[PDB]
Amino acid sequence: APAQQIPFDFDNGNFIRDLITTHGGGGYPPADAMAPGDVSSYTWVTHLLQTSWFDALAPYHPTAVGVYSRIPRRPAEESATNRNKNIAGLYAMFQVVKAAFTERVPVLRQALGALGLDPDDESQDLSTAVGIGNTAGKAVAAARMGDGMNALGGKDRTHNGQPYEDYTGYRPVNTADELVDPSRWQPAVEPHRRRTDGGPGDKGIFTAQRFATPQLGLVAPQTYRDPARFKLAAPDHLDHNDAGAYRQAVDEVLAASAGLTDEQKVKAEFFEHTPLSVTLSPRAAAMAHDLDLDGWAQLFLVCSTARFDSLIAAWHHKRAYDTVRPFSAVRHVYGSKPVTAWGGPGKGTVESIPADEWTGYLPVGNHPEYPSGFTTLIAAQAQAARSFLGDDVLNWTHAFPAGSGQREPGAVPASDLELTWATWTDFENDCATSRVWAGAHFTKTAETSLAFGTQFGDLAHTFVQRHINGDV
Amino acid sequence: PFDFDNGNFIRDLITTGGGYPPADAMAPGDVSSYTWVTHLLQTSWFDALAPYHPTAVGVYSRIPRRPAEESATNRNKNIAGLYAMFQVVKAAFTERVPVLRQALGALGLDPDDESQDLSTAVGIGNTAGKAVAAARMGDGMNALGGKDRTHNGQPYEDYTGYRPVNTADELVDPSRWQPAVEPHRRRTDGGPGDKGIFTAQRFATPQLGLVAPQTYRDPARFKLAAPDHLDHNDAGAYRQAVDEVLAASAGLTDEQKVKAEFFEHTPLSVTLSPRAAAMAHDLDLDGWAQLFLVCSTARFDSLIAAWHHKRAYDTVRPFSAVRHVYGSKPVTAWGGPGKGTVESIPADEWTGYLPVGNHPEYPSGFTTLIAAQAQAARSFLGDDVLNWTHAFPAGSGQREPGAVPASDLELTWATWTDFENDCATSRVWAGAHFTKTAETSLAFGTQFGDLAHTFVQRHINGDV
Numbered sequence: 001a002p003a004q005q006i007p008f009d010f011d012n013g014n015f016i017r018d019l020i021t022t023h024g025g026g027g028y029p030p031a032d033a034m035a036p037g038d039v040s041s042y043t044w045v046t047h048l049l050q051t052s053w054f055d056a057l058a059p060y061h062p063t064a065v066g067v068y069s070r071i072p073r074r075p076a077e078e079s080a081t082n083r084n085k086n087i088a089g090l091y092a093m094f095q096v097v098k099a100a101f102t103e104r105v106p107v108l109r110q111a112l113g114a115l116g117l118d119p120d121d122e123s124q125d126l127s128t129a130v131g132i133g134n135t136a137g138k139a140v141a142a143a144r145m146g147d148g149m150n151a152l153g154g155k156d157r158t159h160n161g162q163p164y165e166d167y168t169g170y171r172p173v174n175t176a177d178e179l180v181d182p183s184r185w186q187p188a189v190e191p192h193r194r195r196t197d198g199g200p201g202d203k204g205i206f207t208a209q210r211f212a213t214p215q216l217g218l219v220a221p222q223t224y225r226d227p228a229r230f231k232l233a234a235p236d237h238l239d240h241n242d243a244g245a246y247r248q249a250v251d252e253v254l255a256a257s258a259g260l261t262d263e264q265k266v267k268a269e270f271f272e273h274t275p276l277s278v279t280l281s282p283r284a285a286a287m288a289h290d291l292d293l294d295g296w297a298q299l300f301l302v303c304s305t306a307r308f309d310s311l312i313a314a315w316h317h318k319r320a321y322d323t324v325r326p327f328s329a330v331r332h333v334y335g336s337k338p339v340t341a342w343g344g345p346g347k348g349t350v351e352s353i354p355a356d357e358w359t360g361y362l363p364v365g366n367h368p369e370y371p372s373g374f375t376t377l378i379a380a381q382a383q384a385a386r387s388f389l390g391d392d393v394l395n396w397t398h399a400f401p402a403g404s405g406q407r408e409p410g411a412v413p414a415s416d417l418e419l420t421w422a423t424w425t426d427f428e429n430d431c432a433t434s435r436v437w438a439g440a441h442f443t444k445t446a447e448t449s450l451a452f453g454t455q456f457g458d459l460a461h462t463f464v465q466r467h468i469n470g471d472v
Numbered sequence: 473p474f475d476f477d478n479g480n481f482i483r484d485l486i487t488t489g490g491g492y493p494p495a496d497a498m499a500p501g502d503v504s505s506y507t508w509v510t511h512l513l514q515t516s517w518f519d520a521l522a523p524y525h526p527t528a529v530g531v532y533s534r535i536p537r538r539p540a541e542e543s544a545t546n547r548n549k550n551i552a553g554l555y556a557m558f559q560v561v562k563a564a565f566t567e568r569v570p571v572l573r574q575a576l577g578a579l580g581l582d583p584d585d586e587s588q589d590l591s592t593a594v595g596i597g598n599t600a601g602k603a604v605a606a607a608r609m610g611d612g613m614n615a616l617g618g619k620d621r622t623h624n625g626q627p628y629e630d631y632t633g634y635r636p637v638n639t640a641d642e643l644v645d646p647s648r649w650q651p652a653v654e655p656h657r658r659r660t661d662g663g664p665g666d667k668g669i670f671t672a673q674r675f676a677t678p679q680l681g682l683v684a685p686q687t688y689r690d691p692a693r694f695k696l697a698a699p700d701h702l703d704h705n706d707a708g709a710y711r712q713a714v715d716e717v718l719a720a721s722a723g724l725t726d727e728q729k730v731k732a733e734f735f736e737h738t739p740l741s742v743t744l745s746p747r748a749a750a751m752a753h754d755l756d757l758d759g760w761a762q763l764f765l766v767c768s769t770a771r772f773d774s775l776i777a778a779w780h781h782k783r784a785y786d787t788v789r790p791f792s793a794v795r796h797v798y799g800s801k802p803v804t805a806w807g808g809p810g811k812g813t814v815e816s817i818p819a820d821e822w823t824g825y826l827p828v829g830n831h832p833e834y835p836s837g838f839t840t841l842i843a844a845q846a847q848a849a850r851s852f853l854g855d856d857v858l859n860w861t862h863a864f865p866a867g868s869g870q871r872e873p874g875a876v877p878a879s880d881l882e883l884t885w886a887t888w889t890d891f892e893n894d895c896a897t898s899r900v901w902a903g904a905h906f907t908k909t910a911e912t913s914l915a916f917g918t919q920f921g922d923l924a925h926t927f928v929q930r931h932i933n934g935d936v
């Protein structure tokens with residue numbers, strides 16, 4: 001309803017917990033223009049969003065300073081309640097949304113109006129919460145909208161630019177029709193409605209994949225400068241000239257496909273679903289650790305910084321190694337010969353699906369295979385939360401009603417399902433293995449990605465502590 | 473309120489100007505899947521009405537003729553046509569099932585009635601619609617996705633093994649089609665899709681050239697001249713074709729931009745031009761079903777032939793040809809949204825006003841189809857009269873919303889000849905086609921309207 005108001009206690013509430021990250025604890029969130037499996041654009045925009053929270057609250061802190069702005073500190077009385085911090089954080093992310101997520105502006109404008117806040121207030125009075133928030137959010141957008149991500153589309157061109165357009169000149173050595181180098185990434189052919197549950201798009205249209213925002217590997221990281229300094233071993237397990245090792249890596253993917261259970265299917269979908277598994281695991285960790293509003297903003301910043309910097313490094317190596325995905329390797333080893341694996345929707349495991357008709361449980365991501373973006377990112381986020389919160393406790397239970405699976409709706413899971421992760425360690429280990437259940441990654445890739453991501457959580461923790469303490 | 477006895481379900485319900493219709497899962501510019509599914513829908517109308525006609529027989533079914541008293545009013549014919557297309561929707565357009573179920577319920581018809589009593593309108597309609605789907609869902613279009621595979625098939629999947637000789641990144645043969653790189657939200661107004669994702673084009677349903685046509689058996693028998701204007705080894709002719717496209721781009725007016733969008737909007741220009749012709753000729757319900765079948769048959773068979781030649785000639789689109797001729801050099805053309813004509817847009821940053829279609833250039837699908845449809849309506853209705861006016865309020869353009877057109881605009885086509893001539897030239901304004909391609913496509917499509925008229929008359933007369 002146009003006049004409906006949102007109940008929220010500005011004085012004692014927590015806008016991150018009570019407004020932004022609220023959910024019923026079951027199923028998947030509503031869909032919008034950001035596809036849940038598109039981790040690169042998701043991680044980039046979410047970092048702008050969640051950093052604006054921290055920068056908006058920093059002047060209300062006794063010592064903290066912002067990442068992208070330095071706003072003169074407020075008297076302590078302005079933090080006696082959470083009202084100013086709540087207002088400032090909301091306006092800061094509103095500025096980021098207006099700059100980087102214009103699709104969300106109408107819903108956010110309506111939510112702000114329902115909270116009693118003027119959605120057209122562009123004041124930048126630095127003694128007011130709205131002015132601090134607007135200033136902090138604008139500073140994040142001003143520093144990042146023109147970064148290497150090309151989020152506005154103007155990089156290296158003057159006409160007809162499109163947001164997130166690749167300006168780096170990446171070209172695969174394989175086409176979707178011909179596997180010239182079986183060690184190298186090959187674009188998949190996918191229906192235009194390309195999400196796990198179909199999703200938005202055009203009926204009867206097919207496309208060939210393009211490397212998703214390869215320029216991500218070039219954007220300025222938050223805690224370091226050059227992602228090449230984080231060395232990653234070569235993916236020797238996928239050298240097609242070592243036919244025995246290549247075939248073993250393929251057979252492990254097919255065996256994972258053949259062994260799929262309801263729980264593995266749901267976990268495959270869960271860990272690829274960025275607005276749920278990635279965004280809301282810090283919420284679960286925060287709920288288990290009794291953090292105040294400042295602690296939530298700090299935890300989310302440390303997690304987002306870890307995701308941001310680890311994914312840049314993962315994307316750098318994705319392009320440098322440019323590694324083949326499982327579906328191409330399955331076809332390379334077996335051609336049209338039948339294999340034992342998932343037969344497709346409603347089919348369960350079958351003994352004789354032709355290898356060139358096999359597909360992973362989830363639609364394969366549109367970028368090279370090595371390393372795993374999700375696994376690197378979650379390992380970084382798990383380490384960041386570990387370091388900030390002081391322990392490994394996560395205690396996240398999420399419910400999946402019968403038939404709520406997106407790949408096989410109405411059939412998977414066969415009955416109501418509750419998944420629980422007591423620790424980040426359980427969480428990140430499930431993420432890595434679920435990438436193999438999804439058919440998106442080889443076992444060794446997921447294992448190496450787990451080890452590769454952890455270090456970025458430590459860098460993120462140091463970075464956020466430096467800003468909490470005032471950056472002197 | 474719809475009147476079953478004297479009303480017309482095609483006129484009063486299905487095809488009920490200004491602006492563009494609401495968007496759904498079928499993108500308006502995607503002509504191949506649109507024409508295929510629409511032919512099943514509109515053929516089911518005719519087959520449902522044939523037993524209620526004194527002599528007509530169905531295309532995909534033969535239902536024993538009804539007593540004339542059951543055609544005294546339009547009630548049975550209206551009921552039968554609605555259930556017939558409902559059967560096609562359930563088989564070939566499942567996305568539309570909820571809206572149609574609701575529309576039938578609002579009319580007082582049970583959307584769960586699967587009766588096939590051939591003495592009742594619901595039974596005749598259900599039977600006529602199911603026969604169309606049974607005959608066509610497994611044709612060469614691969615609409616269900618099972619062609620030449622047993623696992624993980626996807627509707628409309630290309631089974632033909634077509635691949636371009638160019639990749640989206642490298643133009644090796646400038647005479648041949650090169651797929652474009654496009655944002656995933658790929659429609660003129662953006663459209664549904666995923667933020668921040670780009671794709672390389674795939675030839676849209678190349679198998680369309682292989683599906684069994686309605687009025688002939690082999691599309692190769694319809695000769696189409698070679699696109700000599702696009703032989704890159706003849707640099708002068710190639711550059712002339714390119715420069716004509718750039719000059720059309722530089723000369724774009726509000727009217728040309730809106731007409732470019734209009735003729736690429738299949739649910740409007742293609743679907744509703746027979747409505748305008750039917751309205752201008754005061755046809756009864758039978759005449760509407762017959763006209764739409766002649767038009768749909770002409771579109772179906774002409775587009776099959778166009779798709780056959782699109783694959784055989786596999787010709788380059790203007791954006792690739794502009795890049796071949798000029799590389800990065802500046803040209804005079806449209807500068808992009810909000811910029812108008814500019815003197816120095818780098819050629820490798822130029823784009824047509826509308827997103828280029830995802831199939832080879834020669835011949836033009838829209839132009840061939842409209843020329844076939846225009847001829848079909850001409851032959852059936854006996855004259856060239858169309859008398860269609862469509863309004864575009866200020867700012868209603870999809871490519872440049874709020875700016876184009878600068879003021880309220882009315883487009884009028886008195887005749888099919890004016891309509892098809894505007895369609896051909898608008899493909900050049902759109903940047904999608906070369907001038908000679910549009911001209912040749914107009915000449916190529918006309919013949920399929922004559923074939924369609926003969927085919928429908930044979931069925932109207934009883935197919936003896």
Ligand SMILES: [Cl-]
Nearest residue numbers: 633634635783
């Ligand atoms: Cl071919």
Ligand SMILES: [Mg+2]
Nearest residue numbers: 013014292293
């Ligand atoms: Mg608190």
Ligand SMILES: [Mg+2]
Nearest residue numbers: 478480756757
């Ligand atoms: Mg009538």
